[PDB]
Amino acid sequence: LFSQIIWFVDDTNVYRVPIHKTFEGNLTTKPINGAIFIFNPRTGQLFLKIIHTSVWAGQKRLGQLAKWKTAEEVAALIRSLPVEEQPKQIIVTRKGMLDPLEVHLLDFPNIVIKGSELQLPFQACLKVEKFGDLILKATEPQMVLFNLYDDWLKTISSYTAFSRLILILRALHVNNDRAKVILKPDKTTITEPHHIWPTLTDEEWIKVEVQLKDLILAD
């Protein structure tokens, strides 16, 4: 990482069907809005492609179709960017994305596509209010830009920032309530309106990061 433009692509949250049993005793099939997370680990840039439920109108094997829709949307984003902003490598968090991406990116022979064993659970972002409500309440597809490193890169490297983010996401994923406590060390801890994460000192982040690691280790 950190050397060529690299994107992580997570399709885990694209096709979302909540588990519920009706009064008649059957599983519901109604989806809710999802999203594709497309993330540059050097700069912190997130492209959030919100996927509105209308796109599923009609067809079957929607789990499988969603991998293709993800590939389509990644290709559309690439085509909308100047060549110098296009990724050289795409790393997919799930192996089901490899073939659909390969087929959708035949016009981009320069782009290397690979899988990964890295635990990078963007699904945890659905528990962060900024993202969760935006996704839920959308009435049409759209793309939203974010900076997942807030102002961190003013004082730390991309490597330190990436590690910090991964710890935050994994901790939120494994134990949301406890992670949120760890990330609010004081009553006065705040998150700026345009930031994703709390404003903490360097020293406070060291302590937070140790705690997040311990939480992940525990479960």
Swiss-Prot record:
Region RNase H homology domain, residue ranges: 1-219
Disulfide bonds: none
Tissues where the protein occurs: Widely expressed.
Location relative to the cell: Nucleus; Nucleus speckle
Function (record text): Plays a role in pre-mRNA splicing as core component of precatalytic, catalytic and postcatalytic spliceosomal complexes, both of the predominant U2-type spliceosome and the minor U12-type spliceosome. Functions as a scaffold that mediates the ordered assembly of spliceosomal proteins and snRNAs. Required for the assembly of the U4/U6-U5 tri-snRNP complex, a building block of the spliceosome. Functions as a scaffold that positions spliceosomal U2, U5 and U6 snRNAs at splice sites on pre-mRNA substrates, so that splicing can occur. Interacts with both the 5' and the 3' splice site.
Pathology noted in the entry: Retinitis pigmentosa 13: A retinal dystrophy belonging to the group of pigmentary retinopathies. Retinitis pigmentosa is characterized by retinal pigment deposits visible on fundus examination and primary loss of rod photoreceptor cells followed by secondary loss of cone photoreceptors. Patients typically have night vision blindness and loss of midperipheral visual field. As their condition progresses, they lose their far peripheral visual field and eventually central vision as well.
Subunit structure, as described in the record: Part of the U5 snRNP complex. Component of the U4/U6-U5 tri-snRNP complex composed of the U4, U6 and U5 snRNAs and at least PRPF3, PRPF4, PRPF6, PRPF8, PRPF31, SNRNP200, TXNL4A, SNRNP40, DDX23, CD2BP2, PPIH, SNU13, EFTUD2, SART1 and USP39. Component of the U5.U4atac/U6atac snRNP complexes in U12-dependent spliceosomes. Within the minor spliceosome, which acts on U12-type introns, interacts with PPIL2 and RBM48. Core component of U2-type precatalytic, catalytic and postcatalytic spliceosomal complexes. Found in a mRNA splicing-dependent exon junction complex (EJC) with SRRM1.
Entry note about domains: The MPN (JAB/Mov34) domain mediates interaction with TSSC4 and SNRNP200. Has structural similarity with deubiquitinating enzymes, but lacks the residues that would bind the catalytic metal ion. Contains a region with structural similarity to reverse transcriptase, presenting the classical thumb, fingers and palm architecture, but lacks enzyme activity, since the essential metal-binding residues are not conserved.
Name assigned to this protein: Pre-mRNA-processing-splicing factor 8
Organism the protein comes from: Homo sapiens (Human)
Lineage: Eukaryota, Metazoa, Chordata, Craniata, Vertebrata
